[PDB]
Design an enzyme around this catalytic site. Sequence first.
Site, PDB file in Angstrom:
ATOM      1  N   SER A  98      18.012 -19.879  34.399  1.00  0.00           N
ATOM      2  CA  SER A  98      18.595 -21.222  34.195  1.00  0.00           C
ATOM      3  C   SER A  98      20.050 -21.282  34.573  1.00  0.00           C
ATOM      4  O   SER A  98      20.822 -20.378  34.221  1.00  0.00           O
ATOM      5  CB  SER A  98      18.501 -21.629  32.719  1.00  0.00           C
TER       6      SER A  98
ATOM      7  N   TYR B 177      20.707 -26.879  37.885  1.00  0.00           N
ATOM      8  CA  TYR B 177      21.061 -28.177  37.422  1.00  0.00           C
ATOM      9  C   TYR B 177      22.251 -28.555  38.296  1.00  0.00           C
ATOM     10  O   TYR B 177      23.297 -27.879  38.256  1.00  0.00           O
ATOM     11  CB  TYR B 177      21.472 -28.146  35.949  1.00  0.00           C
TER      12      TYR B 177
ATOM     13  N   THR C 288      15.460 -28.661  38.758  1.00  0.00           N
ATOM     14  CA  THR C 288      14.958 -29.364  37.590  1.00  0.00           C
ATOM     15  C   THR C 288      15.565 -30.748  37.620  1.00  0.00           C
ATOM     16  O   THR C 288      16.786 -30.914  37.581  1.00  0.00           O
ATOM     17  CB  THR C 288      15.339 -28.640  36.287  1.00  0.00           C
TER      18      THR C 288
ATOM     19  N   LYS D  39      10.888 -29.381  39.897  1.00  0.00           N
ATOM     20  CA  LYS D  39      10.394 -29.159  38.533  1.00  0.00           C
ATOM     21  C   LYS D  39      10.572 -30.381  37.628  1.00  0.00           C
ATOM     22  O   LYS D  39      11.647 -31.018  37.599  1.00  0.00           O
ATOM     23  CB  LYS D  39      11.090 -27.932  37.915  1.00  0.00           C
TER      24      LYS D  39
ATOM     25  N   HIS E 219       9.026 -30.463  30.579  1.00  0.00           N
ATOM     26  CA  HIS E 219      10.188 -29.845  29.959  1.00  0.00           C
ATOM     27  C   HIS E 219       9.874 -29.535  28.526  1.00  0.00           C
ATOM     28  O   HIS E 219      10.729 -29.612  27.656  1.00  0.00           O
ATOM     29  CB  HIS E 219      11.431 -30.774  30.052  1.00  0.00           C
TER      30      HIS E 219
HETATM   31  C1  LIG Z   1      14.804 -23.876  24.429  1.00  0.00           C
HETATM   32  C2  LIG Z   1      14.450 -24.425  25.717  1.00  0.00           C
HETATM   33  C3  LIG Z   1      15.454 -24.585  26.691  1.00  0.00           C
HETATM   34  C4  LIG Z   1      15.120 -25.090  27.943  1.00  0.00           C
HETATM   35  C5  LIG Z   1      13.798 -25.461  28.237  1.00  0.00           C
HETATM   36  C6  LIG Z   1      12.798 -25.307  27.249  1.00  0.00           C
HETATM   37  C7  LIG Z   1      13.127 -24.789  25.992  1.00  0.00           C
HETATM   38  C8  LIG Z   1      12.090 -24.619  25.020  1.00  0.00           C
HETATM   39  N1  LIG Z   1      13.526 -25.944  29.495  1.00  0.00           N
HETATM   40  C9  LIG Z   1      12.112 -26.237  29.913  1.00  0.00           C
HETATM   41  C10 LIG Z   1      11.281 -24.990  30.191  1.00  0.00           C
HETATM   42  O1  LIG Z   1      11.610 -24.485  31.498  1.00  0.00           O
HETATM   43  C11 LIG Z   1       9.757 -25.252  30.218  1.00  0.00           C
HETATM   44  O2  LIG Z   1       9.447 -26.443  30.993  1.00  0.00           O
HETATM   45  C12 LIG Z   1       9.177 -25.393  28.792  1.00  0.00           C
HETATM   46  O3  LIG Z   1       9.699 -24.323  27.990  1.00  0.00           O
HETATM   47  C13 LIG Z   1       7.658 -25.317  28.766  1.00  0.00           C
HETATM   48  O4  LIG Z   1       7.205 -25.820  27.494  1.00  0.00           O
HETATM   49  P1  LIG Z   1       6.704 -24.701  26.391  1.00  0.00           P
HETATM   50  O5  LIG Z   1       7.720 -23.624  26.274  1.00  0.00           O
HETATM   51  O6  LIG Z   1       5.324 -24.136  26.852  1.00  0.00           O
HETATM   52  O7  LIG Z   1       6.467 -25.570  25.098  1.00  0.00           O
HETATM   53  C14 LIG Z   1      14.482 -25.823  30.469  1.00  0.00           C
HETATM   54  N2  LIG Z   1      14.126 -26.086  31.766  1.00  0.00           N
HETATM   55  C15 LIG Z   1      14.969 -25.823  32.834  1.00  0.00           C
HETATM   56  O8  LIG Z   1      14.627 -26.089  34.005  1.00  0.00           O
HETATM   57  N3  LIG Z   1      16.204 -25.320  32.554  1.00  0.00           N
HETATM   58  C16 LIG Z   1      16.621 -25.074  31.238  1.00  0.00           C
HETATM   59  O9  LIG Z   1      17.737 -24.606  31.036  1.00  0.00           O
HETATM   60  C17 LIG Z   1      15.739 -25.320  30.184  1.00  0.00           C
HETATM   61  N4  LIG Z   1      16.111 -25.136  28.896  1.00  0.00           N
END
Ligand SMILES: Cc1cc2c(cc1C)N(C[C@H](O)[C@H](O)[C@H](O)COP(=O)(O)O)c1[nH]c(=O)[nH]c(=O)c1N2
Lengths: 365, 362, 361, 367
Positions: free
Chosen positions: D117, D141, D167, D234, D258
């Site tokens: 990330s 980002y 993303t 994404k 997300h």
């Molecule tokens: C704590 C936390 C923090 C983030 C995320 C999620 C979570 C839980 N997600 C989204 C992540 O990439 C992904 O889409 C989700 O975690 C998938 O959902 P589940 O973890 O299966 O519930 C996310 N996505 C991304 O592109 N960059 C990011 O920095 C983050 N940060």
Amino acid sequence: YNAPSEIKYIDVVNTYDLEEEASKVVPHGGFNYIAGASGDEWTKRANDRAWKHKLLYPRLAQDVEAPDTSTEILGHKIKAPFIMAPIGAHGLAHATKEAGTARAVSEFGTIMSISAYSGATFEEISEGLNGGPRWFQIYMAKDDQQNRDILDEAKGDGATAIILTADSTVSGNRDRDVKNKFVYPFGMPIVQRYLTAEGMSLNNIYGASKQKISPRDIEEIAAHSGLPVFVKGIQHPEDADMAIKAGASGIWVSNHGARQLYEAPGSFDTLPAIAERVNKRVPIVFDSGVRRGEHVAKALASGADVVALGRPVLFGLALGGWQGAYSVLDYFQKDLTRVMQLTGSQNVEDLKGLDLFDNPYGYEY
Amino acid sequence: EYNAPSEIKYIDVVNTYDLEEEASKVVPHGGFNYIAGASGDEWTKRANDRAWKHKLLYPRLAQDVEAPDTSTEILGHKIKAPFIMAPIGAHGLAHATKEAGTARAVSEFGTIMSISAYSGATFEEISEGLNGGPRWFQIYMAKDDQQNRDILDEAKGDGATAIILTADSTVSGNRDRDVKNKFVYPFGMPIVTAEGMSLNNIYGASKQKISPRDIEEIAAHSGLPVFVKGIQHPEDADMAIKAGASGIWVSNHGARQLYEAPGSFDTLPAIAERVNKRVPIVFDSGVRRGEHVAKALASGADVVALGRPVLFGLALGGWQGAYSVLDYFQKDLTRVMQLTGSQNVEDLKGLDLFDNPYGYEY
Amino acid sequence: YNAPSEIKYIDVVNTYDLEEEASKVVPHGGFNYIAGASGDEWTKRANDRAWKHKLLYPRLAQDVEAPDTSTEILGHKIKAPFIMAPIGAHGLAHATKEAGTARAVSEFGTIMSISAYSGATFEEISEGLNGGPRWFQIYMAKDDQQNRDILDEAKGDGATAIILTADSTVSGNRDRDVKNKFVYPFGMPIVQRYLTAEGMSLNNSKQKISPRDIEEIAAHSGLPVFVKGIQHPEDADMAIKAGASGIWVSNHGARQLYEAPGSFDTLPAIAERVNKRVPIVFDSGVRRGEHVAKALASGADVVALGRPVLFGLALGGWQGAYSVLDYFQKDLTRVMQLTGSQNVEDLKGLDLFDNPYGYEY
Amino acid sequence: IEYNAPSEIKYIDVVNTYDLEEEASKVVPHGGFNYIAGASGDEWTKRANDRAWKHKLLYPRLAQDVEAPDTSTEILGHKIKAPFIMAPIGAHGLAHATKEAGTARAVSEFGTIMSISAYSGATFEEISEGLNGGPRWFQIYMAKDDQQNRDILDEAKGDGATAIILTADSTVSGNRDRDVKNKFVYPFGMPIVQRYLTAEGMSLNNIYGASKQKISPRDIEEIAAHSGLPVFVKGIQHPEDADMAIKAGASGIWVSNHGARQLYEAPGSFDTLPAIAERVNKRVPIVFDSGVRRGEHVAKALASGADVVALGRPVLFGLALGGWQGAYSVLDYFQKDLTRVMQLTGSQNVEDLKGLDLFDNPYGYEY
Ligand SMILES: Cc1cc2c(cc1C)N(C[C@H](O)[C@H](O)[C@H](O)COP(=O)(O)O)c1[nH]c(=O)[nH]c(=O)c1N2
Ligand SMILES: Cc1cc2c(cc1C)N(C[C@H](O)[C@H](O)[C@H](O)COP(=O)(O)O)c1[nH]c(=O)[nH]c(=O)c1N2
Ligand SMILES: Cc1cc2c(cc1C)N(C[C@H](O)[C@H](O)[C@H](O)COP(=O)(O)O)c1[nH]c(=O)[nH]c(=O)c1N2
Ligand SMILES: Cc1cc2c(cc1C)N(C[C@H](O)[C@H](O)[C@H](O)COP(=O)(O)O)c1[nH]c(=O)[nH]c(=O)c1N2
């Protein structure tokens, strides 16, 4: 009747939590009058759960920034595509009553709908509006002259549209109000001529208003007032055709916050069929269950031009007076702004064209 | 000793659901649960209730309606509202005045009383309560032909103007509450001793091998219109009419009979489509609100029949309590008529209903 | 392992209540091994809720009295259209183990299915059967000679069909057993040769079962072979092409693949594909006479009973288990009368009402 | 900004991944735990992500002549041990003191791809130490400033990134009620994006707010042109955006909501996958995420048109409970869970998963 009297802004996280919060400051009878609905409230739950039937899509790389929530309806430029629904007896919620709500609505920059069953006079409300736009909601007298008089007073106060609420010819079966033996603790100055309301039940108040409303009433209000007339409480498309034929200048899709006919659909489920029948011939106002910016968006996407807000604004008024109510309006604007950005909507017309995902599984998914 | 309540009073009904728990405070445990309970874990009793949310009423506006008229007529009987009393035996479990008390309520209100063959009262006792009110007699057939002839002759001599053949109880439903409470009948069935008998053995003495010939035989012998009660499948409505029935009575016996079956209201449209207006339709099993009366008529019924809520009213207030329930339904329906745009009962039969594919949880 | 030991008939108001009652008398680990299922048990709940998808009609003036629950399968006359499912380790429920169940089943008048993972020997089970009919359920070994030997012993004991359970090539994800660290408290004498199972976990046998195994079992035993664990209609085609004499629709009581359908929902498609070529046994979730009727109306010829019988055995030994079989026969008799079914063939032709709303209606 | 993440390193016995949530709550500080676990509004869409898995059900299959299923697969030339990768997630230091280097070590040692990330609480150098040469994809980002995007992308590619993930579903924050109620702020910086903000003491809405709002298809084109690496887009839930992304030069489609952390009152992510997969028509690979918790879910995603899935919350909960070893335990759990599912469904290899019949369950969760 010890109505709340605090005046303060409130930090709204979501509007649902405002209900339990207001329950701690509003007197028991009044609170339940505001919160309650017909029967065991299944149709109030249906109004809420209807929002999960059609789901929003996030959309990406849409070239959108700083969405514009503003719109126009019947010539009025408003800050966001929502207005205040007509609700009587705001004094049940806060000592500052309709004048408080009026101040919030005018400061925010939308339209105030004034209920015929207001506990404030036109003069008191007008003081709160300070020049702001307003529409007047009539509950019809049986006597023609009295309807002429009320309409003339409304127009003289500055109303730019008339709302005919036609879904309350008799009261809904509001079990909370029956069990609490609820009666109004103050008068209704605008309709007193045909009743006072203090000490009366709502079933007897609706009882004094007109039962035998017909399409002729819509034509007669339109001709007499010379103002655009909305017909409010529509849930069946045939009534939209009927209202437009009878000279209505708008359709107001509503089930009265589930306070009227029980074991009926959630209001949002009824909207698409109505919008298809109306076919943009006149503007559509949607209400009954709007609690989120996502709901505003889904209503517009489904054929509404604006929505009307009720209980959440009233709970805001209970908790903080005009500033509390304003906090709720501001919340909705900011909530909607987020939803517009994430859905790819630059402006209000974009909301109206959004694709929605059909969810056949319902609330439990 | 079965000691039913005896107080006579009017009651202020907010809704009929609350009458269940209220009645439980005044009726002996065993009897109460006999009345309230249903088959298995009661999933089909819940289905009877929840089916009402499958088809939703529309409010209609500017309909030029005022003071709706709830009156109707069925087989030449003019009644105050489009509901009648369902045939239920042993009203004495609810109240000491038993079937006579219900009869008085029904007669004073202005509808038809259905008398169960398994009533705890005699025709003479019921007739005192009816004070000339119209009545229909519901038979549980005997195996012996002359016994059926005799009972039908007595019913007709008592003033019965229709006969109801309940044919969905050839054996008893699996009523767990009655098994777990170890409940048994505390008094006799004088029209047909029943005292100390289980319902399953009572139903056992009746005819199991009911066939379409029985419908023909009851109609011919009595010379009265015959309703066939318990119908849930459209083929049985066709069979019954072909066999000489003058009415179809759509019912699942208040969910007291076959378990894991549909909610009764869900079965009504297919039955009404098959009947095709040939004979009147009575609908029961789960009616609790004016909205339900309206939905049943909009779906093909001509009237509905009321059961448990009236018994609960009887428990709470004797004939006056039962009367209060009937009055509640009339006023509840009046509201619904006004808000739906229905000036009269024929208008109810023509209402559009909103299809809710999401069911109860929405 | 302090299993129940007392023997008595029991009152069965419904079979669901037996689970709680048995929990009060069966040791915690063994109870939860019997009662539990894979993952969070959603698919075990699905087995149960599937019965509400298709609802029975009461029917009137059907000219029916004293319904006949009897039927025949592969020439065995049975008192009602249900048999005992193959379940190992009955000793978890009752000290009399599979001999207790066998006595109940033979006294009732149906077919006993013997699991290869039985805690009792063939001789112990046979003394409970007293000559009654039995079918043998094999879990295949990797070694061909061990499969030959087990089948020869089963046939020598008197098996008249072989059931190939093929849905357990690896264990389901049974969280209760993992959380309880469950291990069998006793041996499995029929399959001893290839393992003793005392001290062993169930997840610890042939994985690469192919259609050839069905062919080889049929050819070696000369007995009708049922293929058990089928949920997809293509496997019915496969099994019949490979020489199977019966199809046994089952999800192993939800103890195997998680996040799969309720077993009853899979039945019609399989029965359509079978098209009456061979008999069909249905299991996984049967608890009421209504379920027996619905399975038959949906293409099954008989059903197999499992957990409720074991809960009965816990509560009352062979007499307890007998009470459960008797309950099911009486329960079905009521349903037949109310649905207009004079006999078992009539059950197979019943209309069912579709409930699109599901369990909450 | 006081923040005391757990620090113990140990393998954990994973019975299921759901249980890791409550277990992690015992040891992760309240605000950060609820930042990880929570979602938008009343979390109805997080629940939808989970319950969507019951819409399509797996069939057990018998006598399939299957043994020892092979979970290995390949995506854009990377051979990986199982058809799952690590989702890009910032601020892993909220879960464990060893931060993104901890997760990187687990992912690398397990044998799959680490997604980094832009909001990592660790530098490229620190993550690279944990990776020890393992494969990595970088998730951007975007800045509003073009040069800052070029600089970020250059640094990521120099660090060894072999794909870039844009993303695009977080142009503003979701309505994350737990974080509002908790007044959550980051307790440390974000070194990779500091140039346009630092993140220490900032709320996520203001960090998202500094990143680019007016993302358009030209951004996809420019990232692809500048980096010369395959670009995933994404956050896709609507099939038109898959057409849009491919037309704009994307080399992969990453279906996601997300984790339900963004738009509320939207569908469960798995319910959106088939229409996207039908539109993509195998033109480019599909990564699926948002709600994967079981091997059955991995199987169902592949059967419904995904090539791999990405794991998020359960790996972070594992990290919290055991550092890199805890996270490793979660990856291992998924591989073993999937292997069981493959055996019972008749799937010898990953391509067989992609071909599985699914049973349509129109009753949904309550059945
Ligand atoms: C704590 C936390 C923090 C983030 C995320 C999620 C979570 C839980 N997600 C989204 C992540 O990439 C992904 O889409 C989700 O975690 C998938 O959902 P589940 O973890 O299966 O519930 C996310 N996505 C991304 O592109 N960059 C990011 O920095 C983050 N940060
Ligand atoms: C307390 C209270 C009182 C009233 C109302 C509602 C409530 C809650 N409503 C209905 C109102 O205009 C609107 O349709 C509902 O408030 C919309 O439902 P929700 O507020 O979103 O639940 C109403 N409508 C109207 O035309 N005149 C009135 O005086 C009132 N009074
Ligand atoms: C206590 C009790 C006793 C009886 C019944 C019901 C109940 C509740 N019912 C069935 C009755 O006629 C009717 O079908 C149901 O009462 C309708 O269901 P609800 O009362 O609306 O739930 C019944 N029916 C019948 O034809 N003769 C009878 O003697 C009885 N007995
Ligand atoms: C405790 C326990 C143990 C076993 C089983 C089940 C249970 C509950 N089952 C599956 C069994 O044959 C049958 O498919 C299920 O019992 C049917 O599910 P219900 O019992 O109706 O829930 C099973 N099947 C089999 O072929 N051989 C076996 O050894 C076992 N063992």
